[PDB]
Amino acid sequence: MITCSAPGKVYLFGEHAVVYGEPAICCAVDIRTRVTVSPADTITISSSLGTTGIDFEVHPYVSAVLERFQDISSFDGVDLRISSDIPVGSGLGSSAAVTVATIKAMDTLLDLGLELDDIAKMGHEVEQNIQGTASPTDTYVCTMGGVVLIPQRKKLELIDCGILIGNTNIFSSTKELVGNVADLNERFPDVVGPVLSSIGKLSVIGEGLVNDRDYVSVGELMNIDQGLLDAIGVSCAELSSLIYAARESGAYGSKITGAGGGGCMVAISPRENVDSVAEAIGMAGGKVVVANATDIGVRVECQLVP
Ligand SMILES: [Cl-]
Ligand SMILES: [Mg+2]
């Protein structure tokens, strides 16, 4: 019985602007997906969704990983179970965490000696196949953990304060939001162009402020980012409500994390304000997950000797 896990993640800065050549800063958080494997003669994949075989409708990311592995090492089958603390449809790197956890669990089952970089790359390839296109960001951060400046792929000082995630419970149509931004940029290139550049710049100045743990300043830049995301059309009233509530209850800052148009926001907060921010996000109608940043990336949690 092998159990491996991988964390979810938030963007401190830079969602929507990476595809335009701009830097970003992401942070792995301690809501994790666990994948447990044990040898069998048959493939079984059990989740909250149910038990299937290789099934690209119900379990696409796992099915892709298992395919990739049989192509480099034969296996009679595997009893594979998935547990996750990352809310479904939440937009916190769900698919990347399960992909990366599964790869590590299969690397372990079959002793293939994959390094982290290899795991991250195979992760990217898997998301690329399922999603049509994908950026290497999610699988890299979920593989490595900690605070990562993207795409330099540089580790930064872990966020030591409180992190709250507020879910609007509105599923974000990502491809649509990405496409609206590209269309808006095409219609108004000399307006939107600088807005996206401005988002990039938050990570240039933000890198240092994260390293000095100046979370007041980090929070202020996060608020600016939220406004810039609002400007390119990826926010909504539900996001805004949760975001302002977090700010009114003592957060350093708050903004969308990820695709926008619903999904989750994030707030960072002094530890003395965590309960008060959580409560305010709930009272504004969001579902709160209290997390902490984690320097722990993909990990073997269990490797039982029979
Ligand atoms: Cl899956
Ligand atoms: Mg992902």
Residue numbers in the entry: 1 to 306
What does the published report state?
Mevalonate kinase is central to the isoprenoid biosynthesis pathway. Mevalonate kinases (MK) catalyse the phosphorylation of mevalonate. Mevalonate kinases belong to the GHMP kinase superfamily, which includes enzymes such as galactokinase, homoserine kinase, MK and phosphomevalonate kinase. The His tag was not resolved in the structure. Like all GHMP superfamily enzymes, each monomer is composed of two domains: an N-terminal domain and a C-terminal domain separated by a cleft.
In this work, we have identified, purified and characterized, both biochemically and structurally, two previously uncharacterized mevalonate kinases originating from the extremotolerant tardigrade R. varieornatus (Hashimoto et al., 2016; MKvar) and the psychrophilic archaeon M. burtonii. As part of this study, the crystal structure of MKvar with mevalonate in the active site was determined to 2 Å resolution and the crystal structure of MKbur was determined to 2.2 Å resolution. The structures of the archaeal MKs MKmaz and MKbur are highly similar and their sequence alignment shows 61.1% identity and an r.m.s.d. of 0.77 Å; however, their thermostability assay and DSF results show a striking 20°C difference. Measuring residual activity after incubation at temperatures ranging from 25 to 80°C for 5 min revealed that the T 50 values were 40°C for MKbur and 62°C for both MKvar and MKmaz. MKbur, as expected from its psychrophilic origin, appears to conserve activity at low temperature and has relatively low thermostability. In MKvar, Thr119 and Ile215 align with Thr104 and Ile196, respectively, in human MK. MKbur has a conserved Ile residue; however, Thr119, which can be found at the N-terminus of the α4 helix in MKvar, is not present in the N-terminal region of α1 in MKbur.
